PDB file of C-alpha atoms and ligand atoms in Angstrom:
ATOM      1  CA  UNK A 145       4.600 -28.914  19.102  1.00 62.89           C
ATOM      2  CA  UNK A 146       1.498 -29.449  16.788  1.00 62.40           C
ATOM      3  CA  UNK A 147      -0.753 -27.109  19.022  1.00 65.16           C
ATOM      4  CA  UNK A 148       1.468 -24.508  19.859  1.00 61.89           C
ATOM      5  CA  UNK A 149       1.488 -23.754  15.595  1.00 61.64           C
ATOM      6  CA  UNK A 150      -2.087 -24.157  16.235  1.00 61.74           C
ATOM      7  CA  UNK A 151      -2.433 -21.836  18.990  1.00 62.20           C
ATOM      8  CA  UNK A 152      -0.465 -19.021  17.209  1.00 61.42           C
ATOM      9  CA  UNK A 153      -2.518 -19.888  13.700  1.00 60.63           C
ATOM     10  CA  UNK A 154      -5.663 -19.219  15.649  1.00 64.64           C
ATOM     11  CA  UNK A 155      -4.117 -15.678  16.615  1.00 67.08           C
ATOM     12  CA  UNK A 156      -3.175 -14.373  13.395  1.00 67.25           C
ATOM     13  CA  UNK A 157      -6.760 -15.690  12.031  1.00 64.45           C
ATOM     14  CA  UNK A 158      -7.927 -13.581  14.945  1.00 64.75           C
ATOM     15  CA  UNK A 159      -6.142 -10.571  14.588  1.00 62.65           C
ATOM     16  CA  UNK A 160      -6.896 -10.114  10.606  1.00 56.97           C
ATOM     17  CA  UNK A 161     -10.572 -11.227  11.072  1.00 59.51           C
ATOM     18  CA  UNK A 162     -10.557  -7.880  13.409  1.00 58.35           C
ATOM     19  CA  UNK A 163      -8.366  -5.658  12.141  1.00 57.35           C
ATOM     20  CA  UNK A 164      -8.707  -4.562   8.295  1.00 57.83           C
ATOM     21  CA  UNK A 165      -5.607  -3.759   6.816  1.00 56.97           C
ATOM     22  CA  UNK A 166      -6.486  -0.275   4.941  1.00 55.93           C
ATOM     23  CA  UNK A 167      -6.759   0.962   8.478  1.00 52.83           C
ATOM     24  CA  UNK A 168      -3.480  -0.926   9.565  1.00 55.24           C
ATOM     25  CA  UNK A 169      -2.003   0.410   6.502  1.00 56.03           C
ATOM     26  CA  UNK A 170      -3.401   3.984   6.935  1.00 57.14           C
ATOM     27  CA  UNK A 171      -1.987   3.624  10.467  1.00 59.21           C
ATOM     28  CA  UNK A 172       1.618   2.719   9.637  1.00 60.92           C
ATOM     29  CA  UNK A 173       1.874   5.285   7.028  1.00 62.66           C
ATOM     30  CA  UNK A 174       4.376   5.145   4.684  1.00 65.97           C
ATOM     31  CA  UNK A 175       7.624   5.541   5.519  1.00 65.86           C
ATOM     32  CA  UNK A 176       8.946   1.948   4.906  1.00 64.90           C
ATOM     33  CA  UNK A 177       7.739   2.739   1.812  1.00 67.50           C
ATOM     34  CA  UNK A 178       9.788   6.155   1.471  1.00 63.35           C
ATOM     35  CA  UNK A 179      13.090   4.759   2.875  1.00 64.48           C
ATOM     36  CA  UNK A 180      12.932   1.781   0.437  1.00 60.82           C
ATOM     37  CA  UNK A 181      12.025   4.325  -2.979  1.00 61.37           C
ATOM     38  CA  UNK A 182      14.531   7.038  -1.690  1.00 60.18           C
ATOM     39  CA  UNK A 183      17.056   4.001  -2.151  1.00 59.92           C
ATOM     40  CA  UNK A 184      16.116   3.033  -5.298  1.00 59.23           C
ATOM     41  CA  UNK A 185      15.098  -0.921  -4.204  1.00 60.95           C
ATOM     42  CA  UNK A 186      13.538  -3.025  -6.812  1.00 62.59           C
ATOM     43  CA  UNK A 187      13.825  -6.194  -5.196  1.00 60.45           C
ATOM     44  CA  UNK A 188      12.856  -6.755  -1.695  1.00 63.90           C
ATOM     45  CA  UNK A 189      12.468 -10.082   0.229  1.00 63.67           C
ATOM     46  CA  UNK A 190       9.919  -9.960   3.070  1.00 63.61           C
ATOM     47  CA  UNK A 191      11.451 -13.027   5.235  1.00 64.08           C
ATOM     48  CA  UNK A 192       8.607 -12.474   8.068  1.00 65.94           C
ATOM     49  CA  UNK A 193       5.582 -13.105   5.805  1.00 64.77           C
ATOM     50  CA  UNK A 194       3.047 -13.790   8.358  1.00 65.63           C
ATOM     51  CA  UNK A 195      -0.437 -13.832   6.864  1.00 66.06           C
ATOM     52  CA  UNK A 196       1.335 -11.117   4.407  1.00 69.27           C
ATOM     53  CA  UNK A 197       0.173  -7.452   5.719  1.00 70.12           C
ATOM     54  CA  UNK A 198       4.119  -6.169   4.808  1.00 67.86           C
ATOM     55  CA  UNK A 199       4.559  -8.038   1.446  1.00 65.36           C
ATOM     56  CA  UNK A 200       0.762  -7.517   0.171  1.00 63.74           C
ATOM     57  CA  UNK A 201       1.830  -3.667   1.048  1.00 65.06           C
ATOM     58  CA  UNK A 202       5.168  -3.983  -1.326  1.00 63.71           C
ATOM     59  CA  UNK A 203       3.460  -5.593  -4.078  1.00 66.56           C
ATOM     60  CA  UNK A 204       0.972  -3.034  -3.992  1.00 67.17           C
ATOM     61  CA  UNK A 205       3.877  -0.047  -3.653  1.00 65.41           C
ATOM     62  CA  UNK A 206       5.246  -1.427  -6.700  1.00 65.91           C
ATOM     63  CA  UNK A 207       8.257  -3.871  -5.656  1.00 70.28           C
ATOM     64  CA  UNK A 208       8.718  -7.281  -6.744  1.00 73.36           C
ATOM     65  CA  UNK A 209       8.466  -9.206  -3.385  1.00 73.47           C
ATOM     66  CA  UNK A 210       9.779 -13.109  -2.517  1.00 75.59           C
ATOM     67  CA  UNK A 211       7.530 -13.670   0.236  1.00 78.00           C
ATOM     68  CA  UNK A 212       8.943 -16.137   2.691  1.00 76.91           C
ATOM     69  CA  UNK A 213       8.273 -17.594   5.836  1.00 74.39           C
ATOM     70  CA  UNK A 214       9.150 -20.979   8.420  1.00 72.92           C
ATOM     71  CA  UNK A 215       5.392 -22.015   8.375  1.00 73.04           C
ATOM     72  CA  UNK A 216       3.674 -23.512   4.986  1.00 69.34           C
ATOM     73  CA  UNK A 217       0.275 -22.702   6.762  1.00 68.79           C
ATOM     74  CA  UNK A 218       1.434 -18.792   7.216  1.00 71.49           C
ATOM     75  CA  UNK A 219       2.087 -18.889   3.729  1.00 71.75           C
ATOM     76  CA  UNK A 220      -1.177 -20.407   2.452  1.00 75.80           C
ATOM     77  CA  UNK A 221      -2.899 -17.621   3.844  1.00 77.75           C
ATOM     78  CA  UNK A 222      -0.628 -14.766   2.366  1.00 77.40           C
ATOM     79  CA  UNK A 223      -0.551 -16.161  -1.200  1.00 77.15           C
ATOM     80  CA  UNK A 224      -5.053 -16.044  -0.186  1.00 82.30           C
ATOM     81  CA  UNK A 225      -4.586 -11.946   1.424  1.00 84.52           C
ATOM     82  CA  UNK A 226      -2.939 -11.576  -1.542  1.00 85.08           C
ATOM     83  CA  UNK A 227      -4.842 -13.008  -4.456  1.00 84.98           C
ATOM     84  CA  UNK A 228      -7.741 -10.906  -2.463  1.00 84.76           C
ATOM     85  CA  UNK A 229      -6.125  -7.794  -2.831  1.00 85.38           C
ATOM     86  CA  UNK A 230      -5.410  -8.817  -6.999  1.00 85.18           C
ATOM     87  CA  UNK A 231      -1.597  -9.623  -6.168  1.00 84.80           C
ATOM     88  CA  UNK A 232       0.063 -13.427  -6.888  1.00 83.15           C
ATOM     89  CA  UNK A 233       2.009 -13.591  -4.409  1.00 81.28           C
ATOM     90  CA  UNK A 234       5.983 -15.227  -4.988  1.00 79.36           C
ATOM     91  CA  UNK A 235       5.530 -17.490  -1.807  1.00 79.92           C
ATOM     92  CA  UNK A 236       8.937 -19.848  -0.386  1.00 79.15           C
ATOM     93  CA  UNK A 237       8.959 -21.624   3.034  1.00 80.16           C
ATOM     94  CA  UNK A 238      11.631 -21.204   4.609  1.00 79.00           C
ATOM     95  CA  UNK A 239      13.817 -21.330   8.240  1.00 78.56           C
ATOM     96  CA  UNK A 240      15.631 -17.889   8.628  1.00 77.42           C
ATOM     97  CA  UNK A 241      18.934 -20.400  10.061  1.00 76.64           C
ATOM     98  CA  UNK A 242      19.398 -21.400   6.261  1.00 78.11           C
ATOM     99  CA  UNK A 243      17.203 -18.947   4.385  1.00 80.64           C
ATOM    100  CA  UNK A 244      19.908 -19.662   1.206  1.00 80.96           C
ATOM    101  CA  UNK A 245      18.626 -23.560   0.924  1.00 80.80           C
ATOM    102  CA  UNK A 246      15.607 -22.541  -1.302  1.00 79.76           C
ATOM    103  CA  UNK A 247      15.966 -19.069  -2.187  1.00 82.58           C
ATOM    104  CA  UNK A 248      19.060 -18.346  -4.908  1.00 80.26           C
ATOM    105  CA  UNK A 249      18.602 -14.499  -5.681  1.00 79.85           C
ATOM    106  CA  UNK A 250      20.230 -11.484  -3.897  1.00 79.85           C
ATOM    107  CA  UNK A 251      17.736  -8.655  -2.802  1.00 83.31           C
ATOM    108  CA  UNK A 252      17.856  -4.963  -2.530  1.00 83.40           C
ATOM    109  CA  UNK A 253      15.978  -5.116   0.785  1.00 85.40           C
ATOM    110  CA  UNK A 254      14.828  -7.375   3.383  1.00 83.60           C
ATOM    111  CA  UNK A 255      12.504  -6.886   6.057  1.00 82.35           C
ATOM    112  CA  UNK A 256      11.851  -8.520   8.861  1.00 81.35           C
ATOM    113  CA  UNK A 257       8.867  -6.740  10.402  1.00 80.55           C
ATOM    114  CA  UNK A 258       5.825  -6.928  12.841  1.00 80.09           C
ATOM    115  CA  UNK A 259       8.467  -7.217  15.577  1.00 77.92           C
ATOM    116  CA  UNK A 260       9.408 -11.140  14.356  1.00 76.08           C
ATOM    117  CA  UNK A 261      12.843 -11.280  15.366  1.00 74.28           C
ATOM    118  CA  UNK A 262      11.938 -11.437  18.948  1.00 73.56           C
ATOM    119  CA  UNK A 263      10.950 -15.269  18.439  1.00 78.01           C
ATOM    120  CA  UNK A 264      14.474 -16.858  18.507  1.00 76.64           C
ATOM    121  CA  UNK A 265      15.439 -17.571  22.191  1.00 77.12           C
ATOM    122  CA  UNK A 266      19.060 -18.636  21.378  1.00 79.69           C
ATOM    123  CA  UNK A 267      21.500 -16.432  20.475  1.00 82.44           C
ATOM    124  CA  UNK A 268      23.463 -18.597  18.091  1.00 84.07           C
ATOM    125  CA  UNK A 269      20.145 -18.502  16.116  1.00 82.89           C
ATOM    126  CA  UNK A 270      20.255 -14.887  16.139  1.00 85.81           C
ATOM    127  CA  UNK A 271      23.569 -14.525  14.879  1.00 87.33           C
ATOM    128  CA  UNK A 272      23.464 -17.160  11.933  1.00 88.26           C
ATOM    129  CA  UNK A 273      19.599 -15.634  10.941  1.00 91.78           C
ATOM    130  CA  UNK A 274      21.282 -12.373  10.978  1.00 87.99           C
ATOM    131  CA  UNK A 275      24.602 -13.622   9.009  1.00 89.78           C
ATOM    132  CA  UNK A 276      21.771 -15.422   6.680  1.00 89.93           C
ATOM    133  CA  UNK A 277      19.955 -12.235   5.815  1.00 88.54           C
ATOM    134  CA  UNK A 278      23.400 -10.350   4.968  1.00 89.06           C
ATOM    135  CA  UNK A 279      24.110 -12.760   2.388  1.00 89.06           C
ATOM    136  CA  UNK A 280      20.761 -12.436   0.864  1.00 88.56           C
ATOM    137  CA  UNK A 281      21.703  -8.542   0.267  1.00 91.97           C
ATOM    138  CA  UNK A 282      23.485  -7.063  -2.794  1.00 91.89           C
ATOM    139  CA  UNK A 283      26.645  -5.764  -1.780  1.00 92.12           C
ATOM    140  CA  UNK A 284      24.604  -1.545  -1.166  1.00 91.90           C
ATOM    141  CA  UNK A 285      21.620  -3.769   0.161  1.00 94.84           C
ATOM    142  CA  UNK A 286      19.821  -2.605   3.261  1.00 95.90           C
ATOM    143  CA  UNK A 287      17.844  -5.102   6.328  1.00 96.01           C
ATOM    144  CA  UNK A 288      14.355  -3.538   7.703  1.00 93.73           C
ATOM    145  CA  UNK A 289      13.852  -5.177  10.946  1.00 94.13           C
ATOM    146  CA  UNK A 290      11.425  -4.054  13.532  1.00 94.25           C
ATOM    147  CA  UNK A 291      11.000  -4.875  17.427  1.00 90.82           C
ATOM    148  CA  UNK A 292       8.833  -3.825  20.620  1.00 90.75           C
ATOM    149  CA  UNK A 293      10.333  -1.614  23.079  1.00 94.84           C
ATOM    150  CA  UNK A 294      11.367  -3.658  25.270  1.00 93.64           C
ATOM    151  CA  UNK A 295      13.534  -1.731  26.829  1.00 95.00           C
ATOM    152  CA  UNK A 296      10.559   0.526  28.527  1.00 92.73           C
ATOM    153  CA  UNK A 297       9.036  -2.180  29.998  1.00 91.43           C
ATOM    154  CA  UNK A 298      12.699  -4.292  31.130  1.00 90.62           C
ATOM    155  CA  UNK A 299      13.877  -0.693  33.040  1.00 89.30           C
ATOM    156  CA  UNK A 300      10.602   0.230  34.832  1.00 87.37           C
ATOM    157  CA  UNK A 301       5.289   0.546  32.545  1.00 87.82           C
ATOM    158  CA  UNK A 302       3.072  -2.244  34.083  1.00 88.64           C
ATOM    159  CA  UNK A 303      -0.117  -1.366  31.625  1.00 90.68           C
ATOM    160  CA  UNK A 304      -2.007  -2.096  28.470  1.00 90.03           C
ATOM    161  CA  UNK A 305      -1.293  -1.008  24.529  1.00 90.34           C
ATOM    162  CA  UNK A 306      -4.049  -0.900  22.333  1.00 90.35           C
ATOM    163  CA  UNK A 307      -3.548  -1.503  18.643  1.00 93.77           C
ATOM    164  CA  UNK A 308      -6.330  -0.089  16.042  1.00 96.65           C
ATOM    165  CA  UNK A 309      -8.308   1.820  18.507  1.00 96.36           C
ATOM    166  CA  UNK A 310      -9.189  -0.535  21.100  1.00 95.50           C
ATOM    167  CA  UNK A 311      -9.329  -3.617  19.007  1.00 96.56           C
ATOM    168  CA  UNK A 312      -6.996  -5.557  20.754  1.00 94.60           C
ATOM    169  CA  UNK A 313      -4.892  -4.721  24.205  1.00 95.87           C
ATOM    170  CA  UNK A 314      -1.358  -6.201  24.708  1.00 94.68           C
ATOM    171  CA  UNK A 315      -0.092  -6.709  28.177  1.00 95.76           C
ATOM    172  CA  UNK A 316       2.994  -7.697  29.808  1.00 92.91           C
ATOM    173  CA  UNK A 317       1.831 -10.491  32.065  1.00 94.80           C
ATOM    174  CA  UNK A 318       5.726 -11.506  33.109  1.00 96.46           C
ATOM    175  CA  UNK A 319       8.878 -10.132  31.808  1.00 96.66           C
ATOM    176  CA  UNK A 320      12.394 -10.724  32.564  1.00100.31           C
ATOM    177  CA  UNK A 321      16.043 -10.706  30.354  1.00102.12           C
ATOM    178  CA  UNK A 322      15.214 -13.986  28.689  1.00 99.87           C
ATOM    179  CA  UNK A 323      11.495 -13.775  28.274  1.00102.36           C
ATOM    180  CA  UNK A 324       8.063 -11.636  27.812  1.00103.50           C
ATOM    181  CA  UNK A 325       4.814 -12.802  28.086  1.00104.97           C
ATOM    182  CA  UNK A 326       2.415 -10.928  26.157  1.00107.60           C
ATOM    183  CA  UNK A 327      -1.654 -11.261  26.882  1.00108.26           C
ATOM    184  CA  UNK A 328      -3.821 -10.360  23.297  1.00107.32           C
ATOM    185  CA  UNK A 329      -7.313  -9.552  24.176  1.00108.10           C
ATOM    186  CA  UNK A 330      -9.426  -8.228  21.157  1.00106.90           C
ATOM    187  CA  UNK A 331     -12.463  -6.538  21.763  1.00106.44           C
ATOM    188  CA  UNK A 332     -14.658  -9.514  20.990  1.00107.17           C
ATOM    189  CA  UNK A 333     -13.298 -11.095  24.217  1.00107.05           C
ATOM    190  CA  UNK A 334     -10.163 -13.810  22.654  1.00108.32           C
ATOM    191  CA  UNK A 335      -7.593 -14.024  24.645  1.00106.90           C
ATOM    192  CA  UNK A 336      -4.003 -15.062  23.238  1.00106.58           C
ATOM    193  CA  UNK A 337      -0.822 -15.617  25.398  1.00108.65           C
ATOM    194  CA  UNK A 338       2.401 -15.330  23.822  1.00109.72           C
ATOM    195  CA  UNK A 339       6.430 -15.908  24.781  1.00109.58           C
ATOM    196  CA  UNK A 340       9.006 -13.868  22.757  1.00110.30           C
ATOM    197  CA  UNK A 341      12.598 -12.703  23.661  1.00106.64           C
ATOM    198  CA  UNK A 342      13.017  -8.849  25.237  1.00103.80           C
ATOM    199  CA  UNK A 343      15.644  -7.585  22.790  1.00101.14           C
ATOM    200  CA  UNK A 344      17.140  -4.621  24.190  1.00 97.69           C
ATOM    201  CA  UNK A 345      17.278  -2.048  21.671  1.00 97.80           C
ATOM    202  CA  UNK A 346      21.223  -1.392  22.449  1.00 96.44           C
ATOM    203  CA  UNK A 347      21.399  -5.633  22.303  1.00 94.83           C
ATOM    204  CA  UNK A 348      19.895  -5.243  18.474  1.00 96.99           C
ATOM    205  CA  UNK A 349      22.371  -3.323  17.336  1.00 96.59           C
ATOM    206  CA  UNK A 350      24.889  -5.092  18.870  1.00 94.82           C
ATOM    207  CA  UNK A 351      24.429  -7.891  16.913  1.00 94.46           C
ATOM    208  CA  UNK A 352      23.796  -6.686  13.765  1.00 94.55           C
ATOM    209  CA  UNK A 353      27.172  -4.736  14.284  1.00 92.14           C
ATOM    210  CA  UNK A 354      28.822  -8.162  14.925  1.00 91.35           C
ATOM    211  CA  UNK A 355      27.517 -10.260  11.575  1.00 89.86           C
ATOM    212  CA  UNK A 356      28.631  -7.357   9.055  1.00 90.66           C
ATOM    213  CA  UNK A 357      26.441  -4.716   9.186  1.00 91.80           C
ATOM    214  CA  UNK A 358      28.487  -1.253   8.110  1.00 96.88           C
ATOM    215  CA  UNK A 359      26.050   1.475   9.593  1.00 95.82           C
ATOM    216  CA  UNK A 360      22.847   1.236  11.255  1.00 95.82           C
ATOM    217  CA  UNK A 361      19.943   3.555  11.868  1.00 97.76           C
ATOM    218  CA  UNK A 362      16.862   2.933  14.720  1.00100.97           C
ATOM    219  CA  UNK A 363      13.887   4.836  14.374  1.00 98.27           C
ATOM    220  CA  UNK A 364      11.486   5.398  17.276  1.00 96.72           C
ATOM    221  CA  UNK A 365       8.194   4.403  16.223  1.00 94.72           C
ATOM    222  CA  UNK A 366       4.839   4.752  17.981  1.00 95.19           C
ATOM    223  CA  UNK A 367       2.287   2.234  16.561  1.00 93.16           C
ATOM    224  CA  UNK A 368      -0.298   2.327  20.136  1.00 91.19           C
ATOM    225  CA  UNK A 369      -3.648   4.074  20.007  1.00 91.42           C
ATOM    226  CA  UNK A 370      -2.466   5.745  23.334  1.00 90.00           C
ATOM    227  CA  UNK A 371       0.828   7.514  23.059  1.00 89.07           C
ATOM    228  CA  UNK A 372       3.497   7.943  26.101  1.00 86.12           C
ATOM    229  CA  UNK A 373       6.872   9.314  25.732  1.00 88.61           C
ATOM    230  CA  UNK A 374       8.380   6.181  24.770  1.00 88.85           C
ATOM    231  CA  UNK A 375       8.208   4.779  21.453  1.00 88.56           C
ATOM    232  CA  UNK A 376       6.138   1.372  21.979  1.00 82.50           C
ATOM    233  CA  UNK A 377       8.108   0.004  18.666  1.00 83.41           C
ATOM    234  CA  UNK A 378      11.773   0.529  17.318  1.00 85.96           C
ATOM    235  CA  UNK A 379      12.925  -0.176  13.721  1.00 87.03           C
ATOM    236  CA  UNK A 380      16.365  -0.875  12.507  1.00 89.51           C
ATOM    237  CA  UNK A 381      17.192   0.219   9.369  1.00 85.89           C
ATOM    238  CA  UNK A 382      20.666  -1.559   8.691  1.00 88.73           C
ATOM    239  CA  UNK A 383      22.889  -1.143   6.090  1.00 89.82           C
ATOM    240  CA  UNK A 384      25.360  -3.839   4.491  1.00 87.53           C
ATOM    241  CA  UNK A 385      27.687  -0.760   3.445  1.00 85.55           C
TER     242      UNK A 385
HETATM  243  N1  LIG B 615      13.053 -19.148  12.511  1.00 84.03           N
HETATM  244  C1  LIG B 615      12.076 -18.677  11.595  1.00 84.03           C
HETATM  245  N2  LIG B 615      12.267 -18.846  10.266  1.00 84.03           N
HETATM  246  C2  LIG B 615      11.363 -18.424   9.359  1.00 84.03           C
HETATM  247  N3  LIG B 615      10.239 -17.811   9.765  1.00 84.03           N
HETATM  248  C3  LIG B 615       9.988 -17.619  11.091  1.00 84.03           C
HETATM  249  C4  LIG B 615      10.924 -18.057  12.051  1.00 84.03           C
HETATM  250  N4  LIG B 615      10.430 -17.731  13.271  1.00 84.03           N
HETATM  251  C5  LIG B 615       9.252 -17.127  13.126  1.00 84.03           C
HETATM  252  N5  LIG B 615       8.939 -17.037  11.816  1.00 84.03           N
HETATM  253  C6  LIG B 615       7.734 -16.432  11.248  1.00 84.03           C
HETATM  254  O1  LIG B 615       7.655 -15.056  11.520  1.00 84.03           O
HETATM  255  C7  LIG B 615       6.315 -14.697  11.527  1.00 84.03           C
HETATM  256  C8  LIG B 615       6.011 -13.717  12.655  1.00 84.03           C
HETATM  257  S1  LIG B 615       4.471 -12.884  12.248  1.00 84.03           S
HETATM  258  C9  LIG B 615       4.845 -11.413  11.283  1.00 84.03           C
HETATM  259  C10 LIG B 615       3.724 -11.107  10.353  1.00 84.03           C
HETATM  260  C11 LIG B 615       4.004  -9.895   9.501  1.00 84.03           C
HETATM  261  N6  LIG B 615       5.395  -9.551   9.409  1.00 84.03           N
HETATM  262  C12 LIG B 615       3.172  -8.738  10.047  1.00 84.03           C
HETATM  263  O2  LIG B 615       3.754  -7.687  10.501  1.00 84.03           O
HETATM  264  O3  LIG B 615       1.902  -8.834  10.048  1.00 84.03           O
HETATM  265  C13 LIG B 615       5.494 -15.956  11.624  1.00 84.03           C
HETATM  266  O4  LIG B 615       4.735 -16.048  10.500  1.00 84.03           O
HETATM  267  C14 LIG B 615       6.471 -17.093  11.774  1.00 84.03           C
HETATM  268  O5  LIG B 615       6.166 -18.277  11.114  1.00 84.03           O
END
């Protein structure tokens, strides 16, 4: 599918031409940050690069970051963020199904954030990108990995989030077990439709129960301008022992 990497490469494009990262980053705070310090990690690998808001963050905290992600084009435009906010970036492409193929280091951290997971469909994919991650950690290493609440929206909830003030809305045009559609409008008037898997939080941390994973914490975490009861984001914090 040459347009659909085309179609999603227009969104990203999108959402940093409208949303500044000091604000994102004043936004999200710092408590990735915090949990990562308070463990003493040097070495993290961000295996979700995206145009490289998380990584560009790291670097900047002080961590020496391997920066990877599936698309070459996602990549090209993180090592860019980066050399604009005075970081080289480390950058590897790379499929999380056989992450080990290119990169031959262990990490102290990985994270997987900007809810990312939710793009594998198949659950065999989830379980060997999940078994890939855990051998990527040293033996007291810990996986970051972030999702939507989907939960909130599977069990009742029918409205908008906003993200950055009013920037952009995101809206659950369909959802079902195997599949949310998501409509991005940003406040210039793009619209963006995107397909992603509901992960149940419960469904998670199931999984990364199943591949190895010793003891596992998920945080609520509200990211939307307009807050409701429910966290609109959940992050696992997963350790290997
Ligand atoms: N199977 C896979 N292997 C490697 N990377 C993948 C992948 N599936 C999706 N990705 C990548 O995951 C990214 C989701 S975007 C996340 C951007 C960043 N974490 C942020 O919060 O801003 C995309 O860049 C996409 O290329």
């Amino acid at each position: 599918d040459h347009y659909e990497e085309e179609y999603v490469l227009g969104f990203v494009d999108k959402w940093d031409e409208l949303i500044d990262w000091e604000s994102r980053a004043e936004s999200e705070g710092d408590t990735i940050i915090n949990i990562l310090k308070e463990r003493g990690v040097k070495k993290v690998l961000d295996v979700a690069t995206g145009t490289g808001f998380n990584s560009v963050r790291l670097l900047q905290a002080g961590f020496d970051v391997v920066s990877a992600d599936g698309s070459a084009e996602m990549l090209v435009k993180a090592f860019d963020n980066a050399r604009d906010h005075g970081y080289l970036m480390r950058t590897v492409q790379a499929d999380w199904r056989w992450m080990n193929k290119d990169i031959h280091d262990k990490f102290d951290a990985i994270v997987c954030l900007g809810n990312s997971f939710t793009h594998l469909f198949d659950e065999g994919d989830r379980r060997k990108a999940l078994a890939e991650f855990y051998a990527l950690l040293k033996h007291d290493g810990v996986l970051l990995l972030d999702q939507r609440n989907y939960d909130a929206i599977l069990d009742d909830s029918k409205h908008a989030h906003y993200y950055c003030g009013d920037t952009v809305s995101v809206y659950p045009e369909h959802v079902d077990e195997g599949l949310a559609r998501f409509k991005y409008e940003f406040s210039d008037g793009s619209v963006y439709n995107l397909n992603m898997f509901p992960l149940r939080k419960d469904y998670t941390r199931q999984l990364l129960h199943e591949v190895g994973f010793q003891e596992i914490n998920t945080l609520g975490d509200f990211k939307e301008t307009y807050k409701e009861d429910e966290p609109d984001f959940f992050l696992h914090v997963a350790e290997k022992n």
